[PDB]
Design a protein around this ligand. Structure first.
Ligand SMILES: Nc1ncnc2c1ncn2[C@@H]1O[C@H](COP(=O)(O)OP(=O)(O)O)[C@@H](O)[C@H]1O
Ligand SMILES: Nc1ncnc2c1ncn2[C@@H]1O[C@H](COP(=O)(O)OP(=O)(O)O)[C@@H](O)[C@H]1O
Ligand SMILES: Nc1ncnc2c1ncn2[C@@H]1O[C@H](COP(=O)(O)OP(=O)(O)O)[C@@H](O)[C@H]1O
Ligand SMILES: [Mg+2]
Ligand SMILES: [Mg+2]
Ligand SMILES: [Mg+2]
Ligand SMILES: [Mg+2]
Ligand SMILES: [Mg+2]
Lengths: 528, 532, 87, 526, 155, 98
């Protein structure tokens, strides 16, 4: 280069181009994949990440681990982005997508180093991915009977498979059953906000319970609350959005009087307004009063005197769940508290759970919502339990949308690799090398499973290849038996869309990474 | 727990780091391979500039910190020392071997199995090369030497100049040929004095039918051209005689001081008179010569050259038949010089070469010697020409000593890859992968050759492999073993008829050294770096 | 110093910033074998290259006293295996 | 400092950037001295870091004083030095040609052509260039003084000394002719050692002359010695004429009273014996490279002998060549033929405020001194450089009697010949061949640009003219900017200078094209 | 084994992946497990002296200089100032035991430390830690069933 | 064409092969390059495509103008020739409609 007294780009601009740039991008992607490599399979191990403020996060989910990493490499960020996309669309496979994309890049790296044009690799990736998606849709097993018992069994097996990789894998059947029940209680949209998740410190994992109703933590009771009865056998619940306490009528309101009689009248008018609201609530017939807005001490004592329960400052989401469970309506005005706007539940109760008081609304027959109460010895323990249950819930929702399952444990990808190699054997040969590289890269997941489990990956892979060659679509890795087995008969089931989205996202990420030839980094502004 | 004052790396981390270092070293010199390779311009951060294509020079000049990179650099240096050619190829092959071996290791293949497979593959490759890929040079003649020199000088600054430089190299090597005991023709390269001087073009560099000294006469008095030279080689200074430490002059009678002082120089005067009385014409000495002895030589009409290099003087004495004389002491305790110690030459001239003068000892009798005067455009070009010339001389020496040559252009590498990937299935269960990876890594040479020419490496290497597979499968197509790479047109070509040859020793030594270096680096799975 | 370096190839003439190494800055170091020999500071109190050479030689520090080759001759130094005529 | 395979200060760059940077650096080096070519060139003022001023228009003088960081510029400067040392002329031309060829090579490098193809085309073109230059050359008769003077004038007309062109040509020709030597069947010129140029500031440049002998800045050791000898017999010596210590340690031990005086008397007697040995040859002048004792001076004056001491070795050799003497180290071995007879006058005269020794009437001298007297030191230095160029040109044409038309005629003729040669190549390398052939037009283009005439019209006219059969001697008049035949203008150049310039430029282009990677920052590692 | 991994690319170009990767440490696999077991063993061995009727108190001093002489394990661990994440896990375990039961906050830490100490020498013999965890779960189920078997009811 | 990763002064990553987008995120400092960038942006605003065409054509025109200046032509002659040729190209272009 030359000094060029007047430069084109400002000082600090960094430019890298050519084969070395793409090789470096592939290496960075390999590093990112290795960062979450050992979290895959029933023998996977959690990762602990400490942030700047000293908080430690323990997780097995690949998307969370990648997000917690402060990745700044422009090419490496693609893997994090596709992991986040897989988490958003599907909810499971966030570890598989990064491994698949990095394996694609690693397999095509030698061809990049020798000067092969990137567009050929991109075309080969697109063709192979289209063929693999078509094959997955073709060979996916579906039940065209809509049997309730069979559908429930399929959902439970899918939840168990999605859960048998986390710290709650020991109790995977219990959690899977509760997850299936919670999803089935959702009405038509399967909204995630309709499944409350409560974490309470202390207690074993088996102490966690699913509430066929709604439950929330006690919210800053006032004086006289302890005199209210804490159990009702058929209460009517008044869902309100009302501030029940003495206060100014309006922010801009002003009272101008010139007589002490009017002064006393004004004071009595304020008291009578409050008592009129309270009397309307009481005469509505309700026994439990919940409000998003604060409820004052005067209202609390008034409700206590009538053997009635009140709870103010309830979170809005908890009121929505209570409305969906009991079946009432949130009222901003108590002027018309008719019978049809009052929620009903069989049993209301306040009980102590590990040093905290929780209100329970059980016995709802028409509830369209749930509430998970999770017990654990630490807040990170419960956070990881919540993450695992979220993965299971997403899988069960997707299975509810369509019951198309493929056997897991790497069997599906072994079949895909066999099919892609067979296809590649019958083409001219320039694309054959790249399609064979794609098929070889598809073998990473069973190899990673064997490596994590401590097996010998080579022998297991050879046995799997020999089995798939001679017939048998659903033979994967048997982790417990140190061998291979028919994973479909072992009930290791995955929704087909999981692997479909994984392949699609990995292919898109690999194509985007390969297509880039030059990277430019402008100096960062406001250096101060 | 260890409480070791240093850093520690263990497992895949250190292995990946070592492979990183080896790959970086390989990528440093990967762009200077093959005829479509290009030179490099090194700056020594004080303004000194070096332009070269030789791998050994590049690796020696670079500053290296990582131990594995140091291993590869020392490997290149050893390859240069023991063979003289293929310094880039051995480094590239070793780095590719290490990369593929680590790729195998990352698949839970034990490094011992990889090392055993590499050893077996290297032995089988050497055996296959010796059995099949060698070509005897007895039936080829001088054309084989010319082609080998031209191939060696490809990728160098004297590439197109090869048509003349190959003839010069062959003549220079053949001039210094001698046969020792056991009747073995030995070619003592590095006895050819290579002199550099900028100025005229490459085409008109001189090959001396004698010897060339980078020295001049000690004084302007003596003539600068003697026809029937009588060279007298001396290993002592011709100066005023000074007594050693153990001798001390003490004078009590003052009348003897003048006699002492006169004798102090009359001793050297008598020595010079004895030397010149036998008819000596040219006097070369390693020591200095002061003014009075120079005047003696001027009056005698002879030549006196001082501060002659010891190796140059030894070569001159051997070529001209003279004998080095560290002293004029015979077995009778006297001080005599006889004509039997005089070496003769057909001419001694002080030629002028680009505003500077040097001494040419033309056509020494009783032995033939050669020297090369390289003419270029500047110092850097002359230095690179000298390096390329040394590479060509080493290649010609290897070809003349061992009479077996192999086709160039990656034909040997492709044949070895095909044969080894076929042979790996013959035996072994886990070292089979190691042998297959050895075969695959042997293809890095034609790949780099194709890349350097901006040709489609995939198609060219695929066609080469198909040709060699047909050669190894069909008995009647065994003539396809010579199918190499023609980088000018980017097509496979029979290199045996094209005249692209390399000594077999180059390939064999490169394979052995690369395999040993890869094995040495592969044994490390833990690094401890103590703080200084 | 630049002029003197030509005549003294055995010397290692060099310069260095004072900042990297203000009592000595507000208003020539000689080494030999790691030990100090000359420590002349503020030499302006006590110029030309000839003057500096004479000043350094009067203290007996500058080495006491060259044909010019074509460009260069040497290539390396090892067991060259010089020609040994036999039979 | 984790890992760091290479050192932290090792910087590496490679690719198209390196080639572009090298070519741009070469172009900048060319642009530095582009305006200093031709009879109408302008001088430049260079500030020496040691405080001096170099005012010149020579290419090598300008480039040698420039310090650069880009190694391609270092290569170009080394090219300039090589051209100066080999032939001594054409220093700006080779730099400009190298820059032009590197530019036209960058043209192809921007496309997908490998540098090796360009290099092979350049080598073929260079061979054809040499062939055409040899073909279009003409012989010269060295016995013709007028044509030798014309050649020297054509060489020096582009320098500041061109005003006194006749005087400069006569001085250079006389010096080169008389320094020419023949001994033992070996021919030599050796302008570097003999033909010394001595410059004395002051006077007028019209008084400059070359003497039939040697002049030195020396005076007699004793005033009583003669400062004017008609036909001196000169004896040259190396050893001192004073009592010196021996090599061995020679401690004495005096016990008797008279030994001290005896030792001093023997010192005096040794000096007297040396002086008698000198006097035995009956000389008139004694020159010594070392000191002469006062007692030796007295003993020499007793025989009426002028003595000069502390003479440089080169000056003593020059005097020996001029007066036909031989330097003798031991006076006792002095013989008759060593006495220098042949000097016709020796005179110590005062110039300005200094004494100068003249030996300026030698018959058939083989050495000489050019006495330059000018306005100042820098002007005299420039005059010395111009006269050195003249002497180098004279030596080149004496060694090679071939002659080539100048003023751009040779470049255009060679370019046309190479163009019609490339017309029948039918290959991929014909384009670089034609480009490097047409790159020779930068010399007539530079001449026209410096003259101030219209570049495009003049080059088009010259190219059209060169397409005819007998038009190889048509160039540009650098003073009027018009096409003119050089067999009338009279500008001619030695063939050796053109051959060296072309070869050096082409090889510089090849050397810089061969490079595509740059690494720097490592220590010397001695 | 520390300060992450740095490569700076095989072509010499800068190779940055994670922000401030030169100031971030990283422990992997067996070494990390050993360090965690060491920290947990240290915490449990500190706690075990305050177990039982003859247990001795720990006299905690906070960052304001106030002194709290106590024998409750949960209080001692909550007032402790630790940086190791495994020590924080021990503190959280004691807090959870205190929240759920209110008694036995010292026994839990000692039991966990003993379990991890045994798991250390189990890992040294080449057992996957997940297998050890599964065996611990099975043994804990057996122990809980036995506890239910031999329990007694009081009025 | 190959995509390019551009990191602007805000660490925002752009992956595209659009000339206008690439030039927008680049920190161009040279005034002449700035003028050519403005020309490309004006082409983008007026039409929406052809920015890379504008950039490469301007670069080629400027290099050939530099060659013409080197061989001896004046700036005014080059400018008038370019204008005449541009008018000729605009006249020719309607006849090339297919
Ligand atoms: N019981 C099992 N046996 C064999 N393989 C399993 C089993 N359960 C899950 N897997 C495999 O482990 C892989 C990783 O799943 P998991 O870690 O839960 O999420 P992710 O796919 O995001 O890594 C899946 O591809 C699945 O095939
Ligand atoms: N004319 C040619 N055609 C094809 N290949 C060649 C030719 N000349 C040399 N080669 C090959 O190029 C390779 C690189 O050689 P090079 O790197 O220059 O030697 P070194 O390794 O000693 O530096 C050699 O292995 C040789 O086989
Ligand atoms: N009177 C003249 N008319 C035209 N051209 C001339 C004349 N004198 C010299 N030249 C040309 O000028 C060139 C000499 O330029 P010069 O300044 O000497 O450069 P250099 O010092 O590198 O030789 C020669 O090639 C010659 O052809
Ligand atoms: Mg999962
Ligand atoms: Mg070679
Ligand atoms: Mg000139
Ligand atoms: Mg207790
Ligand atoms: Mg467009």
């Amino acid at each position: 280069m030359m000094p060029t007294p007047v430069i084109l780009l400002k000082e600090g601009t960094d430019s890298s181009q050519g084969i070395p740039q793409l090789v470096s991008n592939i290496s960075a992607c390999q590093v990112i994949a290795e960062a979450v490599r050992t979290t895959l399979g029933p023998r996977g191990m959690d990762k602990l990440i400490v942030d700047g403020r000293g908080k430690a996060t323990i997780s097995n989910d690949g998307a969370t681990i990648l997000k917690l990493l402060d990745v700044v490499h422009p090419a490496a960020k693609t893997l994090v982005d596709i992991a986040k996309s897989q988490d958003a669309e599907v909810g499971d496979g966030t570890t598989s997508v990064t491994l698949l994309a990095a394996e694609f890049l690693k397999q095509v790296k030698p061809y990049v180093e020798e000067g092969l044009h990137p567009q050929i690799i991109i075309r080969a990736f697109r063709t192979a991915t289209q063929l693999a998606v078509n094959k997955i849709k073709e060979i996916a097993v579906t039940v065209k009977k809509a049997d309730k018992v069979e559908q429930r069994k399929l959902l439970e097996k899918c939840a168990m498979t999605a859960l048998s990789s986390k710290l709650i894998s020991q109790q995977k059947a219990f959690f899977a059953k509760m997850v299936v029940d919670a999803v089935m209680m959702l009405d038509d949209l399967l909204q995630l906000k309709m499944i409350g998740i409560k974490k309470v410190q202390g207690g074993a994992l088996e102490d966690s319970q699913l509430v066929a109703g709604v439950a929330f933590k006690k919210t800053f009771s006032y004086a006289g609350f302890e005199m209210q009865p804490k159990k009702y056998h058929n209460p009517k619940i008044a869902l309100l959005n009302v501030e029940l306490e003495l206060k100014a009528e309006k922010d801009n309101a002003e009272i101008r009087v010139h007589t002490v009689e009017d002064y006393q009248a004004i004071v009595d008018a304020e008291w009578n307004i409050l008592y009129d609201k309270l009397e309307k609530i009481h005469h509505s017939g309700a026994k439990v009063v919940l409000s998003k807005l604060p409820i004052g001490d005067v209202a609390t004592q008034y409700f206590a005197d009538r053997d009635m329960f009140c709870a103010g400052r309830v979170p809005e989401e908890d009121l929505k769940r209570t409305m969906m469970a009991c079946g009432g309506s949130i009222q901003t005005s108590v002027n018309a508290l008719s019978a049809d706007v009052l929620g009903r539940c069989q049993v209301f109760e306040e009980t102590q759970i590990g040093g905290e008081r929780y209100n329970f609304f059980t016995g709802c027959p028409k509830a369209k919502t749930c509430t998970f109460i999770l017990r654990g010895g630490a807040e990170q323990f419960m956070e990881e339990t919540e993450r695992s249950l979220h993965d299971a819930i997403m899988i069960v929702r997707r299975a509810i949308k369509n019951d198309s399952v493929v056997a897991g444990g790497g069997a599906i990808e072994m079949e895909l690799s066999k099919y892609l190699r067979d296809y590649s054997r019958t083409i001219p040969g320039k694309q054959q090398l790249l399609i064979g590289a794609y098929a070889k890269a598809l073998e990473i997941i069973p190899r990673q499973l064997c490596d994590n489990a401590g097996f010998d990956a080579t022998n297991i892979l050879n046995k799997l290849r020999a089995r798939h060659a001679q017939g048998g679509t659903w033979y994967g890795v048997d982790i417990n038996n140190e061998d291979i087995a028919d994973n479909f008969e072992a009930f290791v089931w995955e929704p087909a869309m999981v692997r479909i989205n994984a392949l699609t996202a990995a292919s898109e990420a690999a194509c985007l990474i390969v297509s880039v030839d030059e990277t430019i980094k402008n100096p960062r502004s406001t250096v101060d | 727990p260890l409480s070791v004052f240093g850093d520690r790396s263990t497992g895949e981390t250190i292995r990946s780091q070592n492979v990183m270092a080896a790959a970086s070293i390989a990528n440093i010199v990967k762009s200077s391979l093959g005829p479509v390779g290009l030179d490099k311009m090194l700056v020594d951060d004080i303004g000194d500039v070096t332009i070269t294509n030789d791998g050994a020079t590049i690796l020696k000049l670079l500053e290296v910190e990582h131990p594995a990179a140091k291993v590869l650099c020392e490997l290149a240096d050893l390859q240069d020392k023991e063979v003289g050619d293929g310094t880039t190829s051995v480094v590239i092959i070793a780095a590719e071997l290490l990369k593929n071996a680590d790729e195998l290791v990352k698949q839970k293949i034990h490094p011992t199995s990889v090392i055993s497979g590499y050893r077996l593959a290297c032995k089988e490759a050497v055996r296959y090369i010796n059995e099949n890929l060698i070509v005897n040079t007895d039936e080829l003649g001088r054309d084989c030497l010319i082609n080998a020199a031209k191939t060696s000088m490809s990728s160098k600054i004297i590439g197109i100049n090869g048509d003349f430089f190959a003839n010069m190299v062959v003549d220079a090597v053949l001039a210094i040929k001698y046969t020792d005991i056991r009747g073995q023709p030995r070619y003592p390269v590095n006895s050819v004095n290579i002199l550099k001087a900028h100025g005229r073009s490459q085409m008109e560099s001189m090959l001396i039918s004698g010897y060339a000294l980078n020295c001049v006469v000690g004084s302007q008095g003596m003539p600068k051209r003697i026809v029937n030279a009588k060279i007298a080689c001396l290993d002592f200074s011709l100066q005023k005689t000074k007594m050693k430490l153990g001798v001390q002059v003490v004078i009590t009678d003052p009348e003897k001081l003048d006699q002492i002082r006169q004798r102090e120089s009359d001793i050297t005067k008598e020595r010079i008179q004895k030397i010149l009385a036998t008819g000596a014409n040219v006097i070369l000495t390693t020591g200095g010569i002061d003014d009075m002895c120079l005047k003696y030589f001027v009056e005698a009409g002879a030549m006196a050259v001082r501060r002659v290099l010891k190796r140059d003087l030894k070569r001159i004495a051997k070529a001209s038949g003279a004998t080095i004389l560290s002293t004029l002491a015979n077995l009778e305790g006297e001080e005599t010089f006889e004509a039997a110690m005089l070496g003769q030459a057909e001419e001694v001239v002080q030629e002028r070469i680009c505003d500077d003068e040097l001494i040419l000892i033309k056509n020494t009798k009783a032995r033939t010697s050669a020297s090369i005067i390289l003419r270029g455009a500047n110092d850097f070009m002359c230095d690179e020409m000298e390096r390329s010339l040394h590479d060509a001389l080493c290649v010609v020496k290897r070809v003349l000593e061992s009479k077996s040559v192999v086709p160039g252009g990656g034909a040997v590498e492709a044949a070895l890859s095909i044969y080894l990937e076929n042979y790996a299935t013959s035996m072994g269960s886990r070292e089979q992968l190691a042998i297959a990876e050895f075969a695959r890594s042997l293809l890095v040479i034609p790949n780099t050759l194709a890349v350097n020419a901006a040709q489609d490496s995939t198609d060219l290497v695929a066609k080469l492999r198909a040709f060699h597979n047909e050669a190894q499968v069909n008995p009647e197509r065994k003539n396809l073993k010579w199918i190499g790479l023609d980088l000018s047109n980017g097509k496979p070509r029979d290199n045996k008829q094209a005249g692209v040859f390399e000594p077999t020793i180059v390939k064999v030594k490169s394979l052995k050294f690369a395999t040993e270096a890869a094995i040495t680096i592969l044994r490390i799975d833990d690094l401890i770096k103590l703080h200084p | 110093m630049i002029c003197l370096a030509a005549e003294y190839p055995a010397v290692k003439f060099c310069k260095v910033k004072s900042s990297v190494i203000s009592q000595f800055t507000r208003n020539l170091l000689i080494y030999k074998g790691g030990e100090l020999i000359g420590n002349f500071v503020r030499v302006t109190d006590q110029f030309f290259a000839v003057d500096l050479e004479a000043f350094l030689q009067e203290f007996g520090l500058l080495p006491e006293k060259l044909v010019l080759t074509s460009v260069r001759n040497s290539a390396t130094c090892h067991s060259e295996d010089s020609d040994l005529e036999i039979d | 400092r984790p890992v760091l395979v290479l050192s932290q200060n090792t910087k590496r760059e490679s690719g198209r950037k390196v080639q572009s940077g090298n070519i741009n650096a070469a172009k900048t080096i060319a642009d530095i001295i582009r305006t200093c070519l031709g009879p109408k060139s302008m001088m430049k003022m260079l500030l020496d870091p040691m405080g001096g001023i170099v005012m010149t228009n020579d290419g090598n003088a300008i480039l040698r004083e420039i310090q650069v960081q880009h190694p391609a510029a270092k290569s170009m400067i080394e090219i300039s030095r090589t051209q100066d040392e080999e032939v001594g002329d054409g220093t700006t031309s080779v730099i400009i040609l190298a820059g032009e060829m590197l530019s036209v090579a960058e043209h192809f490098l921007e496309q997908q052509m490998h540098p090796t193809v360009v290099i092979s085309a350049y080598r073929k073109a260079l061979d054809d260039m040499i062939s055409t230059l040899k073909k279009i050359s003409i012989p010269v008769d060295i016995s013709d003084s007028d044509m030798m003077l014309n050649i020297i004038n054509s060489s020096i007309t582009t320098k500041a000394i061109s005003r006194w062109s006749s005087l400069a040509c006569n001085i250079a020709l006389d010096a080169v002719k008389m320094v020419q030597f023949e001994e033992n069947g070996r021919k030599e010129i050796d302008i570097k050692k003999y033909a010394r140029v001595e410059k004395i500031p002051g006077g007028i440049i019209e008084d400059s002359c070359v003497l039939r002998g040697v002049m030195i800045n020396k005076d007699v050791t004793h005033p009583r010695m003669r400062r004017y000898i008609k036909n001196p017999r000169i004896v040259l010596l190396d050893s001192s004429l004073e009592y010196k210590k021996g090599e061995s340690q020679t401690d004495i031990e005096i016990t008797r009273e008279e030994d001290f005086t005896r030792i001093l008397q023997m010192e005096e007697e040794y000096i007297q014996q040396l002086c008698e040995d000198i006097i035995q040859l009956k000389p008139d002048v004694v020159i010594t490279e070392k000191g002469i004792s006062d007692l030796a001076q007295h003993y020499l004056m007793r025989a009426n002998i002028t003595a000069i001491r502390r003479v440089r070795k080169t000056d003593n050799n020059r005097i020996a060549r001029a007066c036909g003497a031989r330097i003798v180290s031991r006076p006792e071995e002095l013989r008759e033929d060593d006495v220098g007879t042949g000097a016709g006058l020796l005179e110590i005269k005062k110039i300005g405020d200094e004494y100068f020794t003249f030996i300026t009437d030698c018959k058939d001298p083989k050495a000489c001194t050019i006495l330059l007297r000018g306005a100042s030191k820098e002007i005299l230095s420039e005059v010395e450089r111009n006269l050195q160029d003249a002497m180098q040109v004279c030596r080149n044409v004496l060694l090679d009697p071939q002659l080539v038309p100048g003023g751009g005629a040779s470049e255009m003729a060679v370019a046309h010949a190479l163009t019609e040669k490339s017309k029948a190549m039918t290959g991929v390398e014909q384009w670089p061949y034609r480009a490097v052939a047409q790159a020779l037009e930068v010399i007539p283009r530079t001449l026209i640009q410096n003259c101030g005439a219209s570049t495009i019209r003049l080059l088009t006219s010259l190219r059209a003219k060169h397409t005819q059969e007998n038009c190889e001697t048509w160039g540009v008049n650098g003073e009027t900017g018009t096409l003119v035949d050089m067999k009338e203008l009279g500008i001619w150049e030695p063939l050796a200078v053109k051959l060296q310039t072309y070869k050096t430029a082409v090889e510089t282009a090849v050397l810089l094209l061969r490079i595509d990677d740059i690494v720097s920052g490592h220590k010397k590692k001695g | 084994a520390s300060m992450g991994t740095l490569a700076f690319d095989e072509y010499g170009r800068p190779f940055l992946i994670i922000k401030d990767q030169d100031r971030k440490s990283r422990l992997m696999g067996l070494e990390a497990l050993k360090s965690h077991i060491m920290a947990a063993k240290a915490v449990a061995n500190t706690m075990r002296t305050s177990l039982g009727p003859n247990g001795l108190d720990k006299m905690m001093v906070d960052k304001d200089g106030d002194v709290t002489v106590t024998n409750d394990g949960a209080t001692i661990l909550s007032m402790m100032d630790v940086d190791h994440q495994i020590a924080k896990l021990m503190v959280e375990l004691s807090k959870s035991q205190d929240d759920e039961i209110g008694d036995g906050t010292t026994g839990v830490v000692v039991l966990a430390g003993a379990l991890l100490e045994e798991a250390e020498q189990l890992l040294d013999r080449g057992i996957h830690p997940i297998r050890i965890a599964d065996g611990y779960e099975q043994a804990a189920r057996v122990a809980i069933e036995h506890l239910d078997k031999i329990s007694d009811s009081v009025l | 064409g190959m995509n390019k990763m551009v990191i602007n002064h805000l660490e925002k990553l752009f992956v595209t092969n659009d000339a206008a987008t690439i030039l927008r995120e680049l920190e161009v400092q040279h005034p002449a390059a700035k003028m050519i960038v403005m020309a490309s942006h004006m082409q983008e605003q007026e039409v929406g495509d052809g920015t890379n065409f504008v950039l490469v054509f301007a670069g080629a025109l400027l290099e050939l103008a530099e060659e013409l200046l080197r061989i001896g032509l004046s700036v005014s002659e080059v400018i008038e020739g370019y204008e005449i040729a541009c008018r000729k190209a605009h006249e020719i272009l309607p006849n090339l409609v297919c």
